[PDB]
Design a protein around this nucleic acid. Sequence first.
RNA 1: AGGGGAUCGAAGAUGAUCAGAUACCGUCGUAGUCUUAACCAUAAACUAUGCCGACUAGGGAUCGGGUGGUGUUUUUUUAAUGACCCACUCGGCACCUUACGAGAAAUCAAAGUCUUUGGGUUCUGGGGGGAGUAUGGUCGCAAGGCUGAAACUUAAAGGAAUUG
RNA 2: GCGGUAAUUCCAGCUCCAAUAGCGUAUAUUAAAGUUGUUGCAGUUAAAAAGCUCGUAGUUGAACUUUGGGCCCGGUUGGCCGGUCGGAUUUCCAACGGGGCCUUUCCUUCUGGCUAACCUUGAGUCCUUGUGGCUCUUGGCGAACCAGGACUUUUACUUUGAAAAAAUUAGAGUGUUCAAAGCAGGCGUAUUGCUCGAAUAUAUUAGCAUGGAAUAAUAGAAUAGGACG
RNA 3: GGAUAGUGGCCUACCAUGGUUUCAACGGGUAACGGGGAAUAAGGGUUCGAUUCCGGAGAGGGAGCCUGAGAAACGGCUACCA
Lengths: 155, 87, 144, 81, 150, 129
Amino acid sequence: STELTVQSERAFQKQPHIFNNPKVKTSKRTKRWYKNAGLGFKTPKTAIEGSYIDKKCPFTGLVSIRGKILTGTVVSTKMHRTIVIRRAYLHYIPKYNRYEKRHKNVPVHVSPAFRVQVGDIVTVGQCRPISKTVRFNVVKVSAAAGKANKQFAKF
Amino acid sequence: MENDKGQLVELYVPRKCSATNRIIKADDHASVQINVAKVDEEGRAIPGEYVTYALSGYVRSRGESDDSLNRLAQNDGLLKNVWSYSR
Amino acid sequence: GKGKPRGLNSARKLRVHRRNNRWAENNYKKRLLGTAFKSSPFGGSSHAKGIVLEKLGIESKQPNSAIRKCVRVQLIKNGKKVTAFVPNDGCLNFVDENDEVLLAGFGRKGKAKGDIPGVRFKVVKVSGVSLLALWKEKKEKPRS
Amino acid sequence: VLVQDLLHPTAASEARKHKLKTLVQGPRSYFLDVKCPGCLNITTVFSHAQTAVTCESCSTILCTPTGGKAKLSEGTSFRRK
Amino acid sequence: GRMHSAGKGISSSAIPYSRNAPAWFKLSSESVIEQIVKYARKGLTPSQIGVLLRDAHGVTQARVITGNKIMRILKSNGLAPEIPEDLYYLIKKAVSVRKHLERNRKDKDAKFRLILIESRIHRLARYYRTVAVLPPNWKYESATASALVN
Amino acid sequence: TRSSVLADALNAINNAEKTGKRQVLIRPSSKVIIKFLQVMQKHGYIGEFEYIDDHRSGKIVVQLNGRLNKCGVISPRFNVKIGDIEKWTANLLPARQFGYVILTTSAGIMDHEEARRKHVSGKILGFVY
RNA sequence: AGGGGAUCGAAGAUGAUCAGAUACCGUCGUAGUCUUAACCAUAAACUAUGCCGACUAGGGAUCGGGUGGUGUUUUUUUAAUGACCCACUCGGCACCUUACGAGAAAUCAAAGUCUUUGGGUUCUGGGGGGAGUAUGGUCGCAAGGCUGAAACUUAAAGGAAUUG
RNA sequence: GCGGUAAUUCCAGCUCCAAUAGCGUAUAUUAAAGUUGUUGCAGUUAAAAAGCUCGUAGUUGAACUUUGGGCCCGGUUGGCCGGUCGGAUUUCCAACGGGGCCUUUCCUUCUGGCUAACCUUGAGUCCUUGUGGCUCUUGGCGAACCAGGACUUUUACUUUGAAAAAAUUAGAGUGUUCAAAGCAGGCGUAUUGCUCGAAUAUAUUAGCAUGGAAUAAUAGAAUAGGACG
RNA sequence: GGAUAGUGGCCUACCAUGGUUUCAACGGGUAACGGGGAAUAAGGGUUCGAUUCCGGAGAGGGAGCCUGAGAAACGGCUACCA
Ligand SMILES: [Mg+2]
Ligand SMILES: [Mg+2]
Ligand SMILES: [Mg+2]
Ligand SMILES: [Mg+2]
Ligand SMILES: [Mg+2]
Ligand SMILES: [Mg+2]
Ligand SMILES: [Mg+2]
Ligand SMILES: [Mg+2]
Ligand SMILES: [Mg+2]
Ligand SMILES: [Mg+2]
Ligand SMILES: [Mg+2]
Ligand SMILES: [Mg+2]
Ligand SMILES: [Mg+2]
Ligand SMILES: [Mg+2]
Ligand SMILES: [Mg+2]
Ligand SMILES: [Mg+2]
Ligand SMILES: [Mg+2]
Ligand SMILES: [Mg+2]
Ligand SMILES: [Mg+2]
Ligand SMILES: [Mg+2]
Ligand SMILES: [Mg+2]
Ligand SMILES: [Mg+2]
Ligand SMILES: [Mg+2]
Ligand SMILES: [Mg+2]
Ligand SMILES: [Mg+2]
Ligand SMILES: [Mg+2]
Ligand SMILES: [Mg+2]
Ligand SMILES: [Mg+2]
Ligand SMILES: [Mg+2]
Ligand SMILES: [Mg+2]
Ligand SMILES: [Mg+2]
Ligand SMILES: [Mg+2]
Ligand SMILES: [Mg+2]
Ligand SMILES: [Mg+2]
Ligand SMILES: [Mg+2]
Ligand SMILES: [Mg+2]
Ligand SMILES: [Mg+2]
Ligand SMILES: [Mg+2]
Ligand SMILES: [Mg+2]
Ligand SMILES: [Mg+2]
Ligand SMILES: [Mg+2]
Ligand SMILES: [Zn+2]
């Protein structure tokens, strides 16, 4: 999320150990740092362009993505800098030789590099424990808006 | 119904209703077999020479015994225009 | 198809219906309600040892006409009182109220046996010496 | 029955069936060119109008709707094409 | 069939096998497209236009002479109504039924048929809402429907 | 509403032979029906069929002889792992020698014995004998 | 809760019958029956038979719509009409005969196209009593509705048909 | 169901049956049970279709979008032959599979590394009247995957494979005297060792890896805010 | 930020209002340690596994802690309850 005035906390936000010497008159005004997550996941330009300060970002922060990579559809965007996705799957009962619809919701951190809204399929990647429940991080958006621009007024 | 070294086993290859090509079993005492004579030059039905058709009991019960014969005897020769392939 | 959803993703509906309809199964019902533990003088066990209160002349049901010799027993582990049969002509001379008999099921899954009304148990031992043995001559009943 | 041609049905027993039960379904209505000699020009009318068709120039009449085929009005010619 | 009754009538158009011309039919796609927009300008429903062109004209069906459906012709030519006409006539009837019911609270039968009409209304709307032709919040409201049609 | 277009095709054919007929009109002629009809005539349980072309889903006319006992469809197109095809043929085929269960694999719609040759599997469609 | 209260009439009172006769039959007649405003939500609410779709068999009636006519009748001057007749075709309520088929049978064009067992889907039942009882929940002004056990008991209960 | 005075059921004698170092009983559970029915039940009247209709969740859901034809490579059974001192491969033949092509035909995609295969051919030719045959460099095949950049509609199913404890199970070898077992053992110069073993299979949901592209979903270009350069 | 060997509402402060659910959350029951496995032999299943191996938990019931690489140890200590 984080929207407008990154310096909005009691503690000054900053990237760790990314020093900017004031004696040397610079034009970028803040030496910024970013990494490439890996597995061919494009580190989106908004992470390099933007000036957010999220330390749980997989592109600008101090987490790493390793292990399971999962996808799922977004079902709530009501938490700040974190969402919840619904991953669906059919589960097999042998005795009847048929299936049943099951599902699990996965809480997943989302860097302000991405702008998400409910309905979007998203690719997440497992990282270290981020919070009490978050064990995945949003890493690539597969939808755009779920045909939102094609829902305008009369012709 | 052969066996390992070709020898014909399992007696009694049954008949077959020429209208349905289904089997005419033993106890099918409702079936039939119709012998048609072989007429020659100027009358003279040849005795002992037949054009035989066999019909199941199921066909004759359903009434199709008549209509099915017209079709079977016509294209086998002994009918001039009576039967119709269209309706 | 008459009822049962034949769909390939209808397993939940098919499981739950089974679950539900098992309850009409008399045995499945008892097994999950733990009836043997709740009801059923025996705690769910094969036998149960108890103590003789009084010797009863239970009169057989129709069309039979007899006096079936039985004993009212107060089970040790339970205190539950139970009237139980003493089979084998004689054998009511062996019991002698206040004694310690070993009851057993009658072999009808509850369900009192025969012309004997409301007797779901039979005696197998008294004073720890095997009713059968006393009947023949093999053992003798202990001191007191 | 029990053996017949379902591919080449006779033109009569076919013609008598319902418009949907023919071998390949098709309409049984038609169009027609109607004209009263008061005018020079013709007007193509549908056989089951539902709309009382009026002609080109004058506020005249041509036909009234019914349950089915339109009742063509007073003396007028027609042809099925 | 008959989603809201028990009748089983089979009664449809037998569309001709000939997908191209009548071939005794004259004037061009220009001729009838112009003729469609003409009636659409009067305000006729795409159905009325199709019937008025079937009888008084030689337009057996407008999809043949012109490669476009009548509703799509009005759309392109900026005559597309706010809501589809079936959902219009459903809402239209629902209002009329309701206007009758508010005047006769003793008419159990009309209260019934209202439910049947409205249930089709809500189901149709859900379809149109799924295919983006209605904003993804559109809802039929009794207190606002009579404003929507008349 | 019509659910398995294949089911209707096969039941019409079974009700045909049972009634002693030699032909049937079937509706409405999906691809899989043809691909099913074609497997039957490969092993001679029907003669030739003709696709008649309305400008709709289509119609078919099948000419059947007398060899067909019962051609059936399996309502849920169950999955069959290659170690279960024998379990299917065993349940619903009159013997080991003859009869075919026809299933649907990635390598095409094909009777079980062919599907054993190419060594591929998938969902089960129906059976012919 | 108003109004209405002719009629018939739970209740009650009677006359008779009966060993008795709180009944059947007769008399009187309260509530009710009718209506408005609100409740109640049950009937052998029945076809004791779910819905959507496919296929499978002959027959003549009738209902509604439609198509066909050098058909009949209404005459005016020939029509137009209207009613009627004949053939067809959809969709009705049914009936008749068959049974390939099904069923334990009675019977059933579905209750058929099932051990050659799979079109989609909903609901209920699992020996008889106990018992639609106890308990809790919930709805109702009430009466009661819906949801709804167990212990114990029991070898039968039951269905259709056959002979008596 | 027997027993109320000739008891084929009780109490015994006699004789007889069944299983037998074992046999009965009680309780539980499994089979019989298609009386829990996915396979596979029943519901007119035997137990069972809600009084009726709407209807959300659930389950389900019409048809149609590269088919058809042509060429090539090399596999595994089976035949008619056996060349050879039980088994062998060529040529002749079918039969059933796999790979790759050209038919308007993404194979994600460019930038080199590499080339295995020929439109190649540079000479001819072991040799059956020669396209039977391969060693063989100087113009001319991409995909066979490396690695670096740039991107990718989603799934279900099925194939194969990796990853995988032992005991248990199924199962091989082996004469614990047999067998349940065990994992031994078997050969000699049995006076200074020889030597076979201690297999194989199942390991099913999920996850990983790979081939397939039927069946069944999903997404796309309609106020063009489209597609390539 | 503190605390931990370290991640983490693990704890604190500040701020926000979120998190789960008929695809059954939450609650109740279990005469419930989980698994390799066991019994029953057409198949599909049904029932069982305290118990020879693996994993977990405990040491009368709770809590606390010393030593130490490793214990919240009990044939270690301290306290309360029995
Ligand atoms: Mg928040
Ligand atoms: Mg019940
Ligand atoms: Mg007593
Ligand atoms: Mg409906
Ligand atoms: Mg009805
Ligand atoms: Mg219909
Ligand atoms: Mg209509
Ligand atoms: Mg009155
Ligand atoms: Mg009285
Ligand atoms: Mg009196
Ligand atoms: Mg009284
Ligand atoms: Mg009722
Ligand atoms: Mg009735
Ligand atoms: Mg009929
Ligand atoms: Mg009969
Ligand atoms: Mg008795
Ligand atoms: Mg005597
Ligand atoms: Mg005697
Ligand atoms: Mg005697
Ligand atoms: Mg035994
Ligand atoms: Mg199955
Ligand atoms: Mg039953
Ligand atoms: Mg009854
Ligand atoms: Mg009943
Ligand atoms: Mg009913
Ligand atoms: Mg309801
Ligand atoms: Mg489909
Ligand atoms: Mg595998
Ligand atoms: Mg925090
Ligand atoms: Mg709150
Ligand atoms: Mg549940
Ligand atoms: Mg426990
Ligand atoms: Mg357990
Ligand atoms: Mg069972
Ligand atoms: Mg255990
Ligand atoms: Mg225990
Ligand atoms: Mg411990
Ligand atoms: Mg102790
Ligand atoms: Mg301790
Ligand atoms: Mg100790
Ligand atoms: Mg210890
Ligand atoms: Zn005019």
